[PDB]
A paper describes a structure:
Reverse transcriptase (RT) from the [name] virus continues to be an attractive drug target for antiretroviral therapy. The drugs that target [name]-1 RT are divided into two classes: nucleoside reverse transcriptase inhibitors (NRTIs) and non-nucleoside reverse transcriptase inhibitors (NNRTIs). NNRTIs significantly inhibit the catalytic function of RT by binding in the non-nucleoside inhibitor binding pocket (NNIBP). The compounds co-crystallized bind the NNIBP causing RT to adopt an “open” conformation commonly observed for RT NNRTI complexes.
The attachment of a longer propoxy morpholine to DATA compound 2 retained potency for RT (WT), RT ([name]), and RT ([name]/[name]) variants. We compared 3 crystal structures of compound 2 in complex with RT (WT), RT ([name]), and RT ([name]/[name]) to examine interactions that promote affinity for [name] and [name]/[name] variants. Key interactions such as the 2 hydrogen bonds with K101 are maintained in the RT ([name]) and RT ([name]/[name]) crystal structures. In both RT ([name]) and RT ([name]/[name]) structures, the absence of Y181 causes the DATA scaffold to shift toward aromatic residues Y183, Y188, and W229 to make van der Waals contacts. Antiviral data also complements the analysis from the structures as compound 2 retains nanomolar potency for the virus containing wild-type RT and variants with [name] and [name]/[name] mutations (WT: 0.0012 µM; [name]: 0.012 µM [name]/[name]: 0.0013 µM). Compound 2 retains affinity for RT (WT), RT ([name]), and RT ([name]/[name]) variants.
Residue numbers in the entry:
A (entry chain A): -1 to 64, 71 to 89, 93 to 216, 225 to 552
B (entry chain B): 5 to 88, 94 to 212, 232 to 428
């Protein structure tokens, strides 16, 4: 007998203050019992389990389902300590000339459970007609379904495989789920040779045993893709069905370019239900139709070659949607993706471009461990002006301008100094809260004035209204004095788009303007030109 | 040579904190470092039975191309009991202060056996392929709050000859850092610090005197536009939240009517007197401003453009413990985030020198941007706490 290296057990403890599981053994049919006896018999013959006595107060219920024994550890997992813990992405793997598969189903039960914990795994098989004490049993190995079995199994296996990994950089190895997958670029002879070497290495521990379907992916030696996407086709649409649909679309968006999930996700707002028949806007129908039309033909991503540049390129899809491709060489994509704006009040394209860049950066660090070179639809000058003048710190990693409309631009720029020869509009607004009744307006140095009465409004909305008014009635250059910190706060953030239609109209006005100086003063200080008396009434 | 019993605080478990992604070079460097740390018994590989985790990454300090292992202990630190040196309030008064890294020393002392589980950390793998390399500490870890507190006895025992030799030199210790102040001449000071380095061996320079607290100033102009006066009044109205007797009414009275912003307005006598009295008031210090050690320090930072940054340290609003400004060019000009990060570091260092603890920053930046880039520029062994402000403050233009 060649001596086997023992797999060292991992010490396992129960959560503090907790006692091991005690749960009533379920009554069964004579048939099921007859099956369980044979199963547990051959298992005991294989050393997987062992018969125990009454000295063990702990009991775990056991079922039989059609043959197959099922131990329900549900109450043991709640009383068992936390263990330590994210799948790899195909765009991160490398091309493999040959990939060989080996069965590890023999080695799963070769991982021993910590002895002092074994007593907690106890389960009982009821005898015929309940006329005897049920056969008592405990696990000597990691039980299928237990809390810590996956972590401990993969830990032991990793620990085993590590020495024949590090010594063979020309070999790649992975375990899914019951299998061992090896791969290499070596000539077929050298590959088979190394396979044999590994088989022997595992033999030491006493383990004698394309395209691949792996985690919703299809893996080919030369490339990868997603397993086919089935989008349910029904004239009736449920909420859970919207969730499933959106999920599958997101899943498909990592390789298929141009996928848009917004219109379908807009309908999931503030609703927890598994059943409603929810209509769809023509926008949503066209969206799903376009996704069906994109999915009409298959596409493939390639694997990663460290010897080449890593490039990310981004395009504006419109309506808060952005789409990106990541490739080493033109038209051959490592992978693709999308980015949707956060739920804001007011926002602009430059901030969204920034956010997308950061997202892609982090994703790239996860997958390839490095930051890609960016190709962005924004001119160097625009980014310059923006980041120099922005009140917030901002940064983008190395990048270049790619000219692919629509371009990201700055739609307006406020002046740094008051404008000479330009009319000065002192604006204000006020609203009585209980009646919701208010006034908005302005006075100017030239004597120009307005006050507009407003129903169903507030101080903030009137303060915005006043500014809008001053923008409507002024020439291409204008100075505007406001006392509103709210308004100034909104405009100093530089939105090019807003939820509020008022702010939107303001933006349109700013866009039409050649020069706008926006100045602030404190309210109610009697500062000349600022007239509370007009709007307050 | 013997471990002091250490525990957590009542009703708290060990930290389980997600490890963020690292680049290929940072991972390689951390592997090269932890390998040797493992051969030296400083750390040890652990198993799946350890649920906890603490983040880790790698930095580079000044004048060194060699990487350093940085563990982010903030969570574990706040889960430790502490309460085991009253701050040296003369350290900020010295002509010069030098910062030395004594972290290495901590590895000469063992950590309590039961506590080691809570120092667990993970070298991540690229693309989630292999599980990470997991370690736990054996000796005293750098960045942990318990390390200086526990090693403190040995530190006092080491520095006795130097301290008693010249009792003009102030010595302070914060985390892995040792701050040594002196009033001597910079050459003789540097040679004295060299002497201290050799003295420590057998077992960055500051000038806190070059700083004071910044006053609020008002313009001196020979002619005022309406705009100039509107700004002046805004600023004074802001200052009135700080100082008692500020009065804007004559200055406002200059503006009555509705006028063009660029129009020059001559100051009346009442207005000039009022402005004078306001200057006088702004000269005096702020009233009833005191440091309460039981309260958090708060740092606010504003980007002034063109490489300039203003900041304030306080505890209660409109009571400022310190105010400052930074133009420094370290090669960060094309990068806002590097400037912000250097700024946060500097401000933190000043905060440590003065009050002995770090403040909690409020940064002019988005969470996602900062979080993506700040480790690239970080040269310090400690990590402060920070929030993010997404709505532009008006105080910016009043601190410039
Ligand atoms: C073998 C294997 C099988 C499956 C699923 C099977 C089922 N069911 C899943 C994985 C994840 C792996 N493991 C693997 N596969 C590849 N390539 C590859 C090529 C072709 C085909 C086909 N046909 C399949 C796979 N490359 C690597 O690793 C290289 C990364 C090197 N670096 C190190 C530095 O940081 C960055 C990564 N690992
Ligand atoms: Mg108002």
């Amino acid at each position: 007998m060649v001596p086997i290296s023992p797999i060292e057990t991992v010490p396992v403890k129960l959560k503090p203050g907790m006692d091991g599981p005690k749960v009533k053994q379920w009554p069964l049919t004579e048939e099921k019992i007859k099956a369980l006896v044979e199963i547990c018999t051959e298992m005991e013959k294989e050393g997987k389990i062992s018969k125990i006595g009454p000295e063990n107060p702990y009991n775990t219920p056991v079922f039989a389902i059609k043959w197959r024994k099922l131990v329900d550890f549900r109450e043991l997992n709640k009383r068992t300590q936390d263990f330590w813990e994210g799948i790899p992405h195909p765009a991160g793997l490398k091309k493999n000339k040959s990939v060989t598969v080996l069965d590890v189903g023999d080695a799963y039960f070769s991982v021993p459970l910590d002895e002092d914990f074994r007593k907690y795994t106890a389960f009982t098989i009821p005898s015929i007609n309940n006329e005897t004490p049920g056969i008592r049993y405990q696990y000597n190995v990691l039980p299928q379904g237990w809390k810590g079995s996956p972590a401990i199994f993969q830990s032991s296996m990793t620990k085993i495989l590590e020495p024949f990994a590090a010594q063979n950089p020309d070999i790649v190895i992975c375990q899914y789920m019951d299998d061992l997958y090896v791969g290499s670029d070596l000539e077929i002879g050298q590959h088979r040779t190394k396979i044999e070497e590994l088989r022997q290495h595992l033999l030491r521990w006493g383990l004698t045993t394309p395209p691949f379907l792996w985690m919703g992916y299809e893996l080919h030696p030369d490339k990868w893709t997603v397993q086919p996407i089935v989008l349910p086709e029904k004239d009736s649409w449920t909420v859970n069905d919207i969730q499933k649909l959106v999920g599958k679309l997101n899943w498909a968006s990592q390789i298929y370019p141009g996928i848009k999930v917004r219109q379908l996700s807009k309908l999931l707002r503030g609703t927890k239900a598994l059943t409603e028949v929810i209509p769809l806007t023509e926008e949503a129908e066209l969206e799903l139709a376009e996704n069906r039309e994109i999915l009409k033909e298959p596409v493939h991503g390639v694997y990663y070659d460290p010897s080449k540049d890593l490039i990310a390129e981004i395009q504006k899809q419109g309506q808060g949607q952005w789409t990106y491709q990541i490739y080493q060489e033109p038209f051959k994509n490592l992978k693709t993706g999308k980015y949707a704006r956060m739920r804001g009040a007011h926002t602009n394209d430059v901030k969204q471009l920034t956010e997308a860049v950061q997202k892609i950066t982090t994703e790239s660090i996860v997958i390839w461990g490095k930051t890609p070179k960016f190709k962005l639809p924004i001119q160097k000058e625009t980014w310059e002006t923006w980041w120099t003048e922005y009140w917030q710190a901002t940064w983008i990693p190395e990048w270049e301008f790619v000219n692919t409309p629509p371009l990201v631009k700055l739609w307006y720029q406020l002046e740094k100094e008051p404008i000479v020869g330009a009319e000065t509009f002192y604006v204000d607004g006020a609203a009585n809260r209980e009646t919701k009744l208010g006034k908005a307006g302005y006075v100017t140095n030239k004597g120009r004035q307005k006050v507009v009465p407003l129903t169903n409004t507030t101080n903030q909305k009137t303060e915005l209204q006043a500014i809008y008014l001053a923008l409507q009635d002024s020439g291409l250059e204008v100075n505007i004095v406001t006392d509103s910190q709210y308004a100034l706060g909104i405009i100093q953030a530089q939105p090019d788009k807003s939820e509020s239609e008022l702010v939107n109209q303001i933006i349109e006005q700013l866009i039409k303007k050649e020069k706008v100086y926006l100045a602030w003063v404190p309210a109610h200080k009697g500062i000349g030109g600022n007239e509370q008396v007009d709007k307050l009434v | 040579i013997e471990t002091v019993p250490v525990k957590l605080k009542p009703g708290m478990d060990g930290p389980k904190v997600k490890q963020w992604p690292l680049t290929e070079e940072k991972i390689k460097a951390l592997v090269e470092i932890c390998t040797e740390m493992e051969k030296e018994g400083k750390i040890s590989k652990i198993g799946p039975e350890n649920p906890y985790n603490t983040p880790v990454f790698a930095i580079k300090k000044k004048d060194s191309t060699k990487w350093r292992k940085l563990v982010d202990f903030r969570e574990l630190n706040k889960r430790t009991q502490d309460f085991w040196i009253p701050h040296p309030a003369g350290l900020k008064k010295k002509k010069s202060v030098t910062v030395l890294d004594v972290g290495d020393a901590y590895f000469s002392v063992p950590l309590d056996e039961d506590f080691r589980k809570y120092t667990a950390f993970t070298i991540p793998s690229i693309n989630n392929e292999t599980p990470g390399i997991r370690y736990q500490y054996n000796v005293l870890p750098q960045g942990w709050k318990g390390s200086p507190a526990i090693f403190q006895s040995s530190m006092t025992k080491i520095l006795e000859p130097f301290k008693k030799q010249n009792p003009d030199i102030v010595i302070y210790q914060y985390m892995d850092d040792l701050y040594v102040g002196s009033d001597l001449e910079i050459g003789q000071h540097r040679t004295k610090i060299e002497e201290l380095r050799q003295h420590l061996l057998r077992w960055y320079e500051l000038h806190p005197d070059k700083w004071t607290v910044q006053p609020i100033v008002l313009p001196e102009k020979d002619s005022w536009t309406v705009n100039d006066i509107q700004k002046l009044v805004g600023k004074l109205n802001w200052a009135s939240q700080i100082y008692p007797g500020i009065k804007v009414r004559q200055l406002s009275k200059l503006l009555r009517g509705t006028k063009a912003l660029t129009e020059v307005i001559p100051l009346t006598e009442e207005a000039e007197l009022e402005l004078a009295e306001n200057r006088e008031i702004l000269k005096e210090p702020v009233h009833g401003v005191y440091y309460d050690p039981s309260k958090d320090l708060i740092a606010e930072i504003q980007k002034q453009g063109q490489g300039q940054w203003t900041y304030q340290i306080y505890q209660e609003p409109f009571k400022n413990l310190k105010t400052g400004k930074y133009a420094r060019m370290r090669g960060a000009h094309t990068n806002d985030v590097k400037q912000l990060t250097e700024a946060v570091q500097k401000i933190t260092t000043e905060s440590i020198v003065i009050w002995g603890k770090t403040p909690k920053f409020k940064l002019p930046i988005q969470k996602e941007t900062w979080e993506t880039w700040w480790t690239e520029y970080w040269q310090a062994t400690w990590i402060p706490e920070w929030e993010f402000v997404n709505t532009p403050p008006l105080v910016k233009l009043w601190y410039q």
